[PDB]
A paper describes a structure:
Botulinum neurotoxins (BoNTs) produced by anaerobic bacteria of the genus Clostridium are the most poisonous bacterial protein toxins known. BoNTs are produced as single precursors that share a common domain organization.
The crystal structure of the complex reveals that DARPin-F5 binds to a substrate-binding site between the α- and β-exosites of LC/A1, far away from the active site of the catalytic domain. These interactions include a salt bridge that is formed between Glu-171 of LC/A1 and Lys-91 of the DARPin, respectively. In addition, Arg-25, and the phenolic hydroxy group of Tyr-50 of DARPin-F5 form hydrogen bonds with the backbone oxygen and the carbonyl group of Glu-171, respectively. Moreover, two additional residues from LC/A1, Lys-128 and Asp-131, are also involved in the complex formation with DARPin-F5. Like Glu-171, these residues are not interacting with the substrate nor the belt, indicating that the binding of the substrate and possibly also belt is prevented through steric hindrance by the DARPin.
Author numbering:
A (entry chain C): 7 to 140
B (entry chain A): 1 to 420
Write the structure that this text describes.
Amino acid sequence: HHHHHHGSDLGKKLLEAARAGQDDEVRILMANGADVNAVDMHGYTPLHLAAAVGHLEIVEVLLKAGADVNAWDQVGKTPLHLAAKWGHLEIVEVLLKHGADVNAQDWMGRTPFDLAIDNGNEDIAEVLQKAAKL
Amino acid sequence: SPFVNKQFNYKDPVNGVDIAYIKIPNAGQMQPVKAFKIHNKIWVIPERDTFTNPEEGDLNPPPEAKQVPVSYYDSTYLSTDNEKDNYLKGVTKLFERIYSTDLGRMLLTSIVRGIPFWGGSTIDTELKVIDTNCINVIQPDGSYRSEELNLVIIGPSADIIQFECKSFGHEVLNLTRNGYGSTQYIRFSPDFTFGFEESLEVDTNPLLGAGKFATDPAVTLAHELIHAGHRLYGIAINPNRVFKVNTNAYYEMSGLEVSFEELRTFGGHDAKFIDSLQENEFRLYYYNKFKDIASTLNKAKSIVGTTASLQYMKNVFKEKYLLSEDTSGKFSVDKLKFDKLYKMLTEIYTEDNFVKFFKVLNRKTYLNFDKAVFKINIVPKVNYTIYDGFNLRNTNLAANFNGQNTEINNMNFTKLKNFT
Ligand SMILES: [Zn+2]
């Protein structure tokens, strides 16, 4: 009746689309059944990439589709770790708003607060600082 | 003048310099393991690799029915101290044998000089080290000192003979294929070797041959060290660029496809399966990648995370990528200088050229079928020597590669599994 066959793996196309900020491509691939929690060879999820590159609307559309806000890569970083590193206040706020673990630690022991202050992101460090002391 | 100055013993105490407890980038919260700095920017973790992959945390094999014929599983290997000592001295002796040839001497010098590029910063104009290109070295206080390194020799994972070269990725960068480079982790054991046949007809047949000869482990490690030389200079080919094998009916039957990367590493006739159009695009593609690194270095205004000067850290990377510096001090890529450097890591550092200089018997192609797996002990000098390997000089083992013959030298090769 409406049977389509997937010629290529949709995970990789969803991860590539989220990395380059093609919101329509993400939204279209999500409509045809791409897995929002797929992984690349390094443990990165579509939310990891959409958060590290700074796309607010991509981060939200995925989180709506059930993306794990606390998934970690092969070195222990979460989407919150990446978004604080690259100075994305709005992405960091959205992730926190959905209950991301502000105390996640990577292989070196660093939290998203440490990554924020280690990359010159003061206003994004005071938010993580406060959210931890809440 | 040895490449590895110390005669390390696993039992040796940790001094915190070249013998220390370290933490590798890992998905878990791993307990520190003992590692030995055998050379500048080269470390040896004589442990089974349960840390690099988040799904291979244990050494349990897959169901007896899902096991592929070409594999060997043994959860107890490299678990006791004595094997950790023997493993460490075996890996050390294998570096000495590689280094005792001008070809391997150049390879090892290109690896130690191939510093992973400092493209970690989030600010356009400052240079910074990528965290996953370092390791966490334990201090006396219990504090952790971060330290840079280029190569790491680690034990095998669940599949003991799954030798490979792997690095950790970046969220926004393609370190292995953008020129930058990344610290390489090699799964390797000097206690195992693959069996093959001298007769090419038998070697290319899945159903014949029982491993008449044994691969020299220095060539196997030299094969993975060439993968490192590619990934450390960031010029590796995407692993999904495969060749539809048409020269081996048995491959064609199963629809197998070998990646251009491994064909390039083997060299000889194998590297010619890549057509001139494919080789030309990569050389030009990575010639431009070095220009982006030369452009990043020219726009460098600051350096963070070290006591070294900005000018000094640019110099490290002018010597790595062989960039040209003009009177004003601006870095450029000289197409001919690059072509010499590019051909060196792709056509000169090959498994084939290494077999020519070791003067050992080896597989004559990468498109063959492994016949068996043997257990070897290369540490005793009556078994295996730096300069001759198994084919010891002045003995009956020198002529006709007899030292590599698993029945004529039947005491140095213990068969564990028959793939044939
Ligand atoms: Zn290989």
